[PDB]
């Protein structure tokens, strides 16, 4: 039964990796940041309330212009808001009503949305024929789609419920590579700022780091007790934050291949369903599941800010590319923008 | 002051009026989640999406036969679904216990805490000849102490013991349901089997509607 020997070097390799991580975790983050000054309870308010969605706002995404933002509701509605004039720039009916994610191309010319039909639909915004239309039906996944993010106007990276992330050439219509290796459904992928690599958190408590071109994993991290719901790379592209059903967040630093901090509290017992850093990084927006969102001092793991606002599950979150606000889309069908 | 943004706001209010129109066409349609283990091809008599109507009331039923079998995530989606058609077989391999723990999980979930289930216990007749010609106690022991309560109307002709088995299964599921959270939601267990179960779904939807309104009015 040579497989037993296989498991044997597997477990000794796990022991070797953990021992090396002990040899690399020789002073935790909280030890040295202790000497630094606090921040103070940030008194963020609402600034706008976007109210046009017939069903739970399940996903959201700003645009690079830091004014427009797309939002997807599971009544089957993908609507592009302008914030300042709070106007419904576009409102898009979908081929199927159940969607778990929207995406806004950094060029601003496309949006992408997908969900329980496994497909990623990419819609052309800046068409010259008037109304917006679905440019591409990226249909190769076997489970549902949970996150989609744009590299550029032509290639999309999409994580599914079949435990595979993927890279598609949008123009071609077929998948560039299949980032396979996970054991639980991928729940959130986060592109590195340089788009040379990206993290993905899944329902096996493990976060994987891949190489966008070689099409193969490069690291796995495990410091979170339960399924990973949300993930967001640091502005550096060196660390990332993960949020899980354990009701805590974790910093996974990419160079040290391990964890740095935990964001936990005695009161919180609800699975956090969204996460994202601010632009600088010193704050961390964790959209919890007791209807609130918390603002964690990422370098202190204290709770500073509390954005309450909502009257249901906050199912998405995202800061502007210029750090101008936070959009929170809950299950009460309101997007609250916060300065 | 809305120099060219006046026309922007004009198109915004036109699309917002469109949002009102499809609010009319949404709040009046019944989203129900199929959850299998049939009639779904017949329940659309009038691939994944399934739309039909009864008494000018429109039903949008989502079947989910396209996912991997780890549901703890892609089921939260249906916290706003009207009902769950929970199509479980009557002949159990141990199918009845897996169905039982699936039903229990659905009932207990924090998002589906306030969703009524419609229980369909398929193939009751097939179970009838199965357990008549030759079993139940071989999987559930507490079937030996069980007898059909007098408030259970049988289908005349078959064995009172077959009816006893059917109602034992139904009594297990309703023990699940009542064991926690009768304040918000209720199981409506039918006994499928080749009739119009569409009428059963429609009447149960009316019952759930009326119960929710009576519960906001502080009556039920």
């Amino acid at each position: 039964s040579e497989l037993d020997q296989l498991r044997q070097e597997a477990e000794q390799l796990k022991n070797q990796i953990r021992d090396a991580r002990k040899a690399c975790a020789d002073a935790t983050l909280s030890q040295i940041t202790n000497n630094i000054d606090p921040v103070g309870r940030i008194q963020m308010r609402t600034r706008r309330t976007l109210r046009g969605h017939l069903a739970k706002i399940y996903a959201m995404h700003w645009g690079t212009d830091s004014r427009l933002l797309v939002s997807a509701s599971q009544d089957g509605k993908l609507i592009i808001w302008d914030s300042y004039t709070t106007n419904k720039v576009h409102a898009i009916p979908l081929r199927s009503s159940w969607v778990m994610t929207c995406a806004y191309a950094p060029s601003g010319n496309y949006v992408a949305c997908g969900g329980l039909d496994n497909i990623c639909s990419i819609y052309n915004l800046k068409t010259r024929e008037g109304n917006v239309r679905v440019s591409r039906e990226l249909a190769g996944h076997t489970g549902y789609l949970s996150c989609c993010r744009f590299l550029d106007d032509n290639q999309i990276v999409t994580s599914s419920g079949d435990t595979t992330c993927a890279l598609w050439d949008i123009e071609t219509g077929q998948q560039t590579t299949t980032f396979t290796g996970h054991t639980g459904d991928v729940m959130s992928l986060s592109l590195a700022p340089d788009t040379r690599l990206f993290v993905s958190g899944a329902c096996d408590a493990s976060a994987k780091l891949w190489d966008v071109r070689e099409g193969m994993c490069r690291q796995t991290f495990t410091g979170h007790e339960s399924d990973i719901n949300a993930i967001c790379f640091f502005p550096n592209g060196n660390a990332f934050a993960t949020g899980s059903d354990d009701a805590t967040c974790r910093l996974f630093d990419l160079r040290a291949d391990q964890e740095l901090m935990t964001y936990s509290h005695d009161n919180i017992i609800c699975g956090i369903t969204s996460v994202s850093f601010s632009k600088s990084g010193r704050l961390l927006l964790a959209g919890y599941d007791d209807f609130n969102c918390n603002v964690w001092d990422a370098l202190k793991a204290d709770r500073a800010g509390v954005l309450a606002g909502h009257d249901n599950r906050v199912s998405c979150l995202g800061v502007t590319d210029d750090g101008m606000a936070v959009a929170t889309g809950s299950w009460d069908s309101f997007l609250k923008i916060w300065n | 002051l809305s120099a060219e943004d006046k026309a922007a706001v004009e198109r915004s209010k036109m699309i917002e009026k469109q949002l009102q129109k499809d609010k009319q066409v949404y709040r009046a349609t019944h989203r129900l989640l199929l959850l299998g283990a049939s009639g779904k091809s017949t329940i659309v008599k009038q691939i994944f999406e399934t739309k039909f109507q009864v008494d000018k009331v429109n039903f949008h039923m989502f079947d989910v036969g396209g996912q991997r079998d780890e549901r703890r995530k892609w089921i939260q989606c249906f916290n706003d679904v009207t009902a769950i058609i929970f199509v479980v077989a009557s002949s159990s391999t141990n199918r009845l216990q897996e169905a039982l723990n699936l039903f229990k999980s659905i009932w207990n979930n924090r998002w589906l805490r306030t969703i009524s289930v419609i229980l369909f216990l398929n193939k009751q007749d097939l179970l009838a000849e199965k357990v008549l010609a030759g079993k139940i106690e071989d999987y559930f022991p507490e079937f030996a102490r069980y007898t059909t309560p007098e408030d259970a109307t049988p289908e005349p002709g078959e064995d009172p013991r077959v009816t006893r088995a059917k109602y034992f299964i139904r009594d297990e599921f309703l023990r699940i349901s009542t064991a926690s959270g009768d304040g918000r939601h209720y199981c409506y267990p039918h006994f499928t089997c080749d009739t119009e179960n569409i009428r059963r779904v429609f009447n149960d939807c009316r019952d759930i509607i009326q119960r929710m309104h009576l519960r906001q009015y502080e009556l039920l």
Partner: single-chain antibody
Amino acid sequence: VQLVESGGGLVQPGGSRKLSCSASGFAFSSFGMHWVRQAPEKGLEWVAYISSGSGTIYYADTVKGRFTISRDDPKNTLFLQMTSLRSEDTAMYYCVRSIYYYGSSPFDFWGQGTTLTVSSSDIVMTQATSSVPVTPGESVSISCRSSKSLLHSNGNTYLYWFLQRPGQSPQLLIYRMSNLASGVPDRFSGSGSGTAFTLTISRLEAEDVGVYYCMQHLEYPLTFGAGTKLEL
């Protein structure tokens, strides 16, 4: 894409007519629509305006009461009723597309147009000059001035540029005085500041000679400049 105006031609003074615009190939209903006139050998001027969903009509002083504007979205066709006709209306009329949201490019397509023949306060736009001799290869700088500031309190400066080649409908080039149009080569580039504006064309070549119109959109009525002619 396909804005075919029709109905024009001969007229008697003070008479009546019904100009139409068969508009096909796009999202007609979502498009606000304009009409614009050009006297046979004079500049441009906006005539009448309808909105999306027929929800707002605007008229220029010279045409209110005498002109009617309407649309038929199911038939996908615009309409203008000419009444109380004067001699100053023997001109070519252009059916015009325009859509307004954040970052849009209105006036994105002016139809072919049709001529009408009938024979017996604002923001003033100072053009550069009617005609300017020019040869290919070098860079040209068409100037423009405004009576008021076109820059708004919101942030946008509301000036548009159009180019008319001989014998065809003019084309939008720049919108909000800085932003290039779709299908228009980088060769053209407009800019400026409050009540001072310019269209600069480098690498000038053929398919570039015509009239350059400097119009505004800060408020109704919409104005124009006479149009700077360029040559070969």
